[PDB]
């Protein structure tokens, strides 16, 4: 972040040809992008989304209506361009990458697939540690690797996506843990809800004060959630603007944040998911969602949908000032 | 609007590879787009926004902090690409056309400008009829002409924009007259507030039974507002998805709706303006705003920012179904 650029950008903003605060929330977004890129007139282009996929042992708790096999079937769907993320990406000038860090089952070699399976799904987080600290570290590096490939190929904006049946439970556990919240706050039918909350509570019961973020993630998180933390850390270190998607993706962002506080300066909330716990995550991060379309899919869809808005926000500072355009002021 | 397609699209949506209702409000948008185009798999591309500009005699009532000259100066800004609308259009693959139906002062010939000045601004709507029915007709037709060129040049979705100092007062008067609302509901320093409400009340007082929508608009509206109705009427007849911008633009759409009841089915609310009366207009139209960014600028900015969302929505139906992708269900 460039303090000087921000100040210069703030001055220009106050001189652009539009009434004060007429572009609402987008004005703040533009100023942040200016400081982030160190340019008074920021500019975004081709974007990229790295969808991290992995399975969860907690599916044994009956926390999902879908069979575990859906995770792998969806990854194939991604590679063939039939998922929602593929379609939104086409409409948002965003490249799509897929990362396998823990899907149950073999996947074929494919141009858009990065195969770094750490293990065939995590252990049941309700009965014990989802993974070992070493496996967590491997997932983290995998996420960083994927992100680095996206960046190397020209990504100017980076978002993360998630795919994993039952990852909302793991997301809830990681969130409740990192934000010191109760199950009921991160888990919003009746009996499935019962299983999810109890699953989260049991997982939290294994934790204790003084634990590092990655240690907590390895205990109650998911492999793709840790990989997502890696995706964001790599993007952050690259100096790129980062876009948040839904609940599971944001949980991964919270992990990255706890590992690097300054990362929050590069975060932009793409949307507000229907997932109740998403609100708490955003408030903790002090971020306002750009979109609110009652989305509840994940895959990085909400993040990708917001990219055009971020590009538009950056262009605001490209507007003419009253002096440049010869426009009279109040 | 094809009911058969709407039904077929609704069926495909329910079978796409994602949880039911997982894509929230965008699913309804997709279905409407499919029905409008008469294709289960709608496709959108280049968009266009026609920004109608004209001055208002009501500025004499002290209803704006900006001098009247700003309308003409902003039109020049549009032609030089320094306005917010130009920046947003760049990020949303949307052509920008400007239509002068009543700006005070001369403008240079320009390929992106349609010069159809009806008169140098309207008369003061608080003291008498803003324009004659004959002038309103010319403004309406100028709007159709500009929209037709946008369409002839390839627009697949159409939005209207407004530029006119003091037009929120004319928009309030027209809205109140068409919807039968009081000045208090449509109008939003306190002294300015008060004079705007009085201006609106005065205009309404001149109305009487037996007046056609065009006669009403001529009496209390603005030239660009009537032109905006023409833009939407032309887009409606061309069978295109139409996108609403802010308060003044939506006032123009209400006029078009009153002249053509079925036009409402082609409308999409781009965003929710900070202008108090905007929500009332959208409620009267029964439309849900896609964006809510606290924008209060106009120019068609909100509508243009929503175009990428409309394109994304159309692509949803291009996703693979469970059966097509070989994904198990739940
Ligand atoms: Na008079």
Swiss-Prot record, chains A, B:
The terms under GO molecular function for this entry are: nicotinate-nucleotide-dimethylbenzimidazole phosphoribosyltransferase activity
Q: What class of enzyme is it?
A: transferase
Identify which residues the record assigns to the active site: 299 (proton acceptor)
The UniProt keywords, alphabetically, are: Cobalamin biosynthesis, Glycosyltransferase, Plasmid, Transferase
Q: What is its EC number?
A: 2.4.2.21
Q: In which pathway does it act?
A: Nucleoside biosynthesis; alpha-ribazole biosynthesis; alpha-ribazole from 5,6-dimethylbenzimidazole: step 1/2
InterPro entries per the record? Nict_dMeBzImd_PRibTrfase, Nict_dMeBzImd_PRibTrfase_bact, Nict_dMeBzImd_PRibTrfase_N, Nict_dMeBzImd_PRibTrfase_sf
The GO annotation for biological process reads: cobalamin biosynthetic process
What does the sequence similarity comment in the record state about its family? Belongs to the CobT family.
Q: What does this protein do?
A: Catalyzes the synthesis of alpha-ribazole-5'-phosphate from nicotinate mononucleotide (NAMN) and 5,6-dimethylbenzimidazole (DMB).
What is this protein's record name? Nicotinate-nucleotide--dimethylbenzimidazole phosphoribosyltransferase
What is the scientific name of the source organism?
Answer: Thermus thermophilus (strain ATCC 27634 / DSM 579 / HB8)
Quote the gene name from the UniProt entry.
cobT
